[PDB]
Amino acid sequence: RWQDTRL
Amino acid sequence: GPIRKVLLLKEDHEGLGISITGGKEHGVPILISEIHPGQPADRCGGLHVGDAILAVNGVNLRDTKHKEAVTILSQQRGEIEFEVVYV
């Protein structure tokens, strides 16, 4: 249920 | 566990080379979900999938929502210091 973002 | 201070050097045209997950809306810290091969975090070393990012460049991420952490992290440039603890 978690967002995941590439940085 | 030990809080490590980890240095990463980044050119402006590069990303950090990490993915993050978690955040306040999920009741957990900002957590590293992936280190990308050949990018600055991988090249410089010291960061670990499953690390909680407690701070970056002195800016506290402990109680940040995901998008807030994305903003702060994305705005850091050059010589960047993370404070992390493996969870």
From Swiss-Prot, chain B:
It is found in: Cytoplasm; Golgi apparatus membrane; Golgi apparatus, trans-Golgi network membrane; Synapse. Ubiquitously expressed. Residues 5-87 form the PDZ domain. Homooligomer. Interacts with FZD5. Interacts with FZD8. Interacts with GRID2 and BECN1. Interacts with CSPG5. Interacts with CLCN3. Interacts with STX6. Interacts with CFTR. Interacts with ASIC3. Interacts with GOLGA3. Interacts with NLGN1. Interacts with RHOQ. Interacts with MARCHF2; the interaction leads to CFTR ubiquitination and degradation. Interacts with ADRB1. May interact with CACNG2. Interacts with CCDC62. Plays a role in intracellular protein trafficking and degradation. May regulate CFTR chloride currents and acid-induced ASIC3 currents by modulating cell surface expression of both channels. May also regulate the intracellular trafficking of the ADR1B receptor. May play a role in autophagy. Together with MARCHF2 mediates the ubiquitination and lysosomal degradation of CFTR. Overexpression results in CFTR intracellular retention and lysosomaldegradation in the lysosomes. It is linked to A chromosomal aberration involving GOPC is found in a glioblastoma multiforme sample. An intra-chromosomal deletion del(6)(q21q21) is responsible for the formation of GOPC-ROS1 chimeric protein which has a constitutive receptor tyrosine kinase activity. The PDZ domain mediates interactions with FZD5, FZD8, ASIC3, GRID2, CLCN3. Also mediates interaction with CFTR and ADRB1. The coiled-coil region probably mediates association to membranes, targeting to the Golgi, and interactions with GOLGA3, and STX6. May also mediate interaction with RHOQ. This is Golgi-associated PDZ and coiled-coil motif-containing protein. It comes from Homo sapiens (Human). The chain holds residues 284 to 370 of 462 of the full protein.
